[PDB]
C-alpha cells in the first residue's frame, strides 16, 4: 500500500479555528485522498491557535459505510491515521475531532 502524509495546520481568524491542509510538497490543498490501493493516511497536527488543540479522533456522519476501516491516534494527540484495509468502493466525508485547553467543547473541522 501507499502511506500518504498531510499536515493539518490550524490557525485562528476572528477568534475561530481555520484548517489548512498542506501536502508533502508544502502545497495547500483540501486534504482529500482519492485512494486506489490499501494503505494509510497520516494527519499531523500543527496547532498555531494557542488553544492547546489535540486530536481525539476522526468523526463520520456515515461511520458504517466501510470506506475507512479504522482510525488510530497517538498518545499526545499530534497524529491521527486513517486505515483503509479492504478497499470498499465509494466516497465518505469526515471531520477531525479535537479537544482544546480553553474550554470543554470539542472542536470540529468543517463538515
Amino acid at each position: 500500500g501507499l502511506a500518504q502524509f498531510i499536515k493539518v495546520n490550524v490557525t485562528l481568524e476572528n477568534g475561530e479555528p481555520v484548517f489548512i491542509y498542506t501536502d508533502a510538497n508544502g502545497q495547500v490543498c483540501q486534504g482529500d485522498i482519492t485512494v486506489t490501493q490499501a494503505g494509510t493516511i497520516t494527519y499531523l497536527l500543527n496547532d498555531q491557535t494557542l488553544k492547546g488543540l489535540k486530536f481525539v479522533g476522526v468523526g463520520f456522519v456515515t461511520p458504517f459505510d466501510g470506506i475507512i476501516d479504522a482510525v488510530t491516534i497517538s498518545s499526545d494527540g499530534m497524529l491521527v491515521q486513517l486505515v483503509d484495509l479492504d478497499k470498499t468502493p465509494g466516497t465518505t466525508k469526515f471531520q477531525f475531532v479535537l479537544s482544546n485547553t480553553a474550554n470543554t467543547l470539542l472542536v470540529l473541522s468543517p463538515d
Binding site: 482529500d32 485522498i33 486506489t36 470506506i67 486513517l82 478497499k87 468502493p89 469526515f94
Partner: peptide, 7 residues
Amino acid sequence: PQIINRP
C-alpha cells in the same frame, strides 16, 4: 475532507 476509494 473527503476520501474517494477507487479500488
